[PDB]
Amino acid sequence: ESADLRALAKHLYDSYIKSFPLTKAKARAILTGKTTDKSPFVIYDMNSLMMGEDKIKFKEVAIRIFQGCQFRSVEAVQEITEYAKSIPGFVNLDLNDQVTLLKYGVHEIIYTMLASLMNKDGVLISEGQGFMTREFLKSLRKPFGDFMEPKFEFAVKFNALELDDSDLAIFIAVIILSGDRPGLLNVKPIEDIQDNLLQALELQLKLNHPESSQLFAKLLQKMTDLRQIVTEHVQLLQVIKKTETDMSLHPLLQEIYKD
Amino acid sequence: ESADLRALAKHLYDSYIKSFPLTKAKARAILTGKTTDKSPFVIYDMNSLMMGEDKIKFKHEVAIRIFQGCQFRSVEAVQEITEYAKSIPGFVNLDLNDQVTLLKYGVHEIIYTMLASLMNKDGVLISEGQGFMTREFLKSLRKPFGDFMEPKFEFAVKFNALELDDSDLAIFIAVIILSGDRPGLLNVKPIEDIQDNLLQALELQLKLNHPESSQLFAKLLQKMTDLRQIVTEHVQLLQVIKKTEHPLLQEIYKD
Ligand SMILES: O=C(Nc1ccc(Oc2ncccn2)cc1C(=O)O)c1ccc(Cl)cc1Cl
Ligand SMILES: O=C(Nc1ccc(Oc2ncccn2)cc1C(=O)O)c1ccc(Cl)cc1Cl
Ligand SMILES: *c1ccc([N+](=O)[O-])cc1C(=O)Nc1ccncc1
């Protein structure tokens, strides 16, 4: 029955709100200059970077940004981990598979939600209190500059779809419950949850964006871009973990990089 | 109006069978030896335990392994309780931060209430009721593990003395979730408005379902002293387990 899938969509959306404090709706308000939200300090140089430390409460500039990009990743993973548990059936799976779904789904999800925080010019940081321009980033020291260029590339293509949070909730869910993840012990129960999620996504996309021809198809196709962006970054780290063997990587993030 | 109260009582029971796989009626059937159709594999010592893994297919040190398997069923319960709560009238209309707060502080109290339905004087149904772990085998676990679940056992025999059925626990569970005294709520009025409704239904339900049982309502609300006291003890023993014992799993099982 059509209407049973609406229940699952509203369920996922509700957990998304509960699990992700910086929704895309909050981000697009900050980024357009709405009055529901307040204005961010923008850093495009070492001066504002250093006035950023003063104004923005947070915790070489090229590594200290990265050390900051890192603790934030940890928080996102913890946030996505909390969201997964809410997906019906996920906690009932084999525990080695739950773990394996999180280890591979997390990066594809990080970059999907990072899109919500980007425009063509830059990205909100520190819960929206900050904004870092694409240019300041591409202008960092030789292994750290290119690091964030392709994420900006994907968000432009992805943000084109004009998804809102209620769509992303279900899409995020589909990403976790994949089944072609390597090492999975029982693909079948994963595949039946995802079959249900895609059904829910399909109805959701068609009702929430009724004039958007093949948005479902276009959206599923975007998992190609996510797959590529992740591998590009996994190699990119490997350069840094050995350019600076004096830069330490957070253990949770490391456990999600079996190379 | 009592016809409205019954309506809500039946609403909740229906939702309680939808949400919770192993009902207390079911758990009783297995435990008594009445329904002899499927009888659960029993774990009474180390040898039976190691055979138990090959028959029951758990999805997860023997004592350390049992604790972790207890943790796995914990996050499953949470998700069933969360799904159940949504079906309590007015729950979802609450401030979303208030819902997360009620659930956050209420899942444990509900976990042990419902654990009591799977227990008796000699042990507990485990897995989906296809196991049974004897209490004496749990007592025999290396410290501090062997004394972890012995306090829960004496709550359950006291709790089960009330002889509550699933339709009672349905409403009783609802009352626990709508506790307007949880740390950091934002709008206590609707929470207490629902709870006084839920208490009214519970009251009329106990009286109709147990006219024999004098003041069972009052006896029931007094047990929520034993619940809060169990929980506060339980939080503390898994903190000295935190000094006795990966990272991804550590995130699924956060406190
Ligand atoms: O910089 C990013 N994130 C953060 C970096 C530093 C930080 O803390 C910080 N900020 C400025 C200077 C030092 N540290 C917080 C964040 C965040 O997103 O929360 C970032 C986000 C998206 C992309 Cl594509 C790239 C980056 Cl480099
Ligand atoms: O045994 C219990 N929980 C489980 C522990 C392990 C487990 O899986 C398992 N079984 C045997 C050995 C290791 N792991 C499944 C359960 C369950 O309740 O479903 C249990 C139930 C009630 C109480 Cl008071 C204590 C425990 Cl330890
Ligand atoms: C077992 C082990 C750890 C925790 N905890 O971290 O709070 C809880 C439990 C437990 O009692 N789990 C359980 C719930 C419902 N039915 C059976 C077992």
Author numbering:
A (entry chain A): 207 to 265, 276 to 475
B (entry chain B): 207 to 266, 276 to 460, 466 to 475
Report text from the authors:
Peroxisome proliferator-activated receptor γ (PPARγ) is a ligand-regulated nuclear receptor transcription factor that regulates gene expression programs controlling adipogenesis and insulin sensitization. Endogenous PPARγ ligands, which include lipids and fatty acids, bind to an orthosteric pocket within the PPARγ ligand-binding domain (LBD) and function as PPARγ agonists that activate gene programs. GW9662 and T0070907 are covalent ligands originally described as antagonists as they bind via a nucleophilic substitution mechanism to Cys285 located within the orthosteric pocket and were shown to inhibit binding of select reference PPARγ agonists. However, we previously showed GW9662 and T0070907 do not block all ligands from binding to PPARγ — and moreover, they have distinct pharmacological PPARγ functions as a transcriptionally neutral antagonist (GW9662) and repressive inverse agonist (T0070907).
To visualize the ligand cobinding poses, we first crystalized complexes of PPARγ LBD covalently bound to GW9662 or T0070907, which produced solvent exposed active (chain A) and inactive (chain B) helix 12 conformations similar to apo-PPARγ LBD, then we added synthetic ligands to the crystals using soaking methods. The BVT.13 cobinding pose is similar to its orthosteric binding pose located near the β-sheet. However, the 2,4-dichloro group clashes with the orthosteric GW9662 and T0070907 binding poses, specifically the phenyl and pyridyl groups respectively, resulting in a slight reorientation of the 2,4-dichloro group to accommodate the cobound state. For BVT.13, the covalent ligand cobinding pose is similar to the orthosteric binding pose. Each of the non-covalent synthetic ligands utilizes unique mechanisms to cobind with the covalent ligands, as inferred from our crystal structures in which pre-formed crystals of the PPARγ LBD were soaked with non-covalent synthetic ligands BVT.13 cobinds to a region of the orthosteric pocket that only slightly overlaps with the orthosteric covalent ligand binding pose, adopting a cobinding pose that is similar to when soaked into apo-PPARγ LBD crystals. MRL24 and nTZDa, which are the most potent non-covalent ligands tested, pushed the covalent ligands into different non-natural conformations, whereas BVT.13 and SR1664 do not. Although these covalent ligands have similar pharmacological functions to orthosteric non-covalent antagonists and inverse agonists, GW9662 and T0070907 function through a different structural mechanism: they slow the rate of exchange between transcriptionally active and repressive conformations natively populated in the apo-LBD, with T0070907 having a more pronounced effect than GW9662.
